[PDB]
Amino acid sequence: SIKAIFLDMDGTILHDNTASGYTKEVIDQLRAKGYKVFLATGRSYAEINQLVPKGFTVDGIISSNGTSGEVKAHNIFRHSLTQEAVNKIVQLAQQQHIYYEVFPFEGQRLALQQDESWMRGMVREEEPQNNVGISEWRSRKDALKGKINWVKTLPETSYSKIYLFTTDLAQITQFRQSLIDQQLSLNISVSNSSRFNAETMAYGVDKGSGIAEMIAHFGIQQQETLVIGD
């Protein structure tokens, strides 16, 4: 029987959205009935906190794709890339003109200002290019419009992940494989959501590991946990 429920979402349904009320109400009910209820999100803790309505409460949140966990506004884990890994991955990307976004745990995603013009160049067109999906194309255009902090030099801070993209399929296939080849040297796990991308996070860390860490904190077993949503 279930003691923990995880809801995976991007937060948007908690805002303006007339369903935020219903979702908040359902979570309150579940919690009142004795369930521990958790959010899982790819968004950062700060972002998800900004989106949710006033009074919205869960027993915990795993954010940044399983790399962070928060309970009563206290961090219980924060799994970072090494600074050395970040620097090497960004170096390789730049050298190959692979569009990249570096995600800190706090603040905007970022990229080096010296790479701004070729990154903007790569998604210049309004229509998606070279078989890239509508959704990923729009996401890149939206990110270039106002979500990237263009920095002169990479900040020294804890880093959740790096996203890598290009419209050149052969190039990204090869680059993704080069990261896989270095999984154990850089201590990273490599994932991808399209054939045009890759993401690198700390080795062995993902939404699943985040869920395991969160339920372990509450003394709940995997077979007592229900995971639903995105």
Added chain:
Amino acid sequence: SIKAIFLDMDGTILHDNTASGYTKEVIDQLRAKGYKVFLATGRSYAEINQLVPKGFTVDGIISSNGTSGEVKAHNIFRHSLTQEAVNKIVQLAQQQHIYYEVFPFEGQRLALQQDESWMRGMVREEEPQNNVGISEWRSRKDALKGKINWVKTLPETSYSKIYLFTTDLAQITQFRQSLIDQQLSLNISVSNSSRFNAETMAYGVDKGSGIAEMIAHFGIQQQETLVIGD
């Protein structure tokens, strides 16, 4: 251990609403995991069916506030007032200028043309009157704008419920009591959602009885059922 989940809602969450998709998706997942998932609604089966997005699927629906149950587009119970009760309640309401809406299981709620003048007059003001809540006031104005079928004579059809309203507190208090007083003679149960209203349905019938009938249809027990939502 839970085998059945009932979601209580008015349907609108499933409409253009970018939450419609998430809700459908969550229901698909729960059903794929082996739960029986049901809707419970105050709307009619026909209304709720045209609100939901395409491909939306549940194991059953209880509608019209527990008075109708549907499984695979077939009716499994349809609990009606008597024609005699409907006629009597309407007569009493008319005599006392208690605003009324008679709800068939199919088609628009209805009221008699001969009563249109004083029904519309009662809620003519844009400002809520006599302490009536904003919500209930707006509901009455919305109903009068285009949700009522004004008939010369009441159709002979199965009827789910009668809603009763007035801005005269003393009058609805007494009228509500009069219906309670006749609960066993008319074979009705009386509920109310504000001090300005009353609703009459078949004796013993409500959302709870509909839930009970629906889970018994699937051989699931009450303690195996989770009920969340409105």
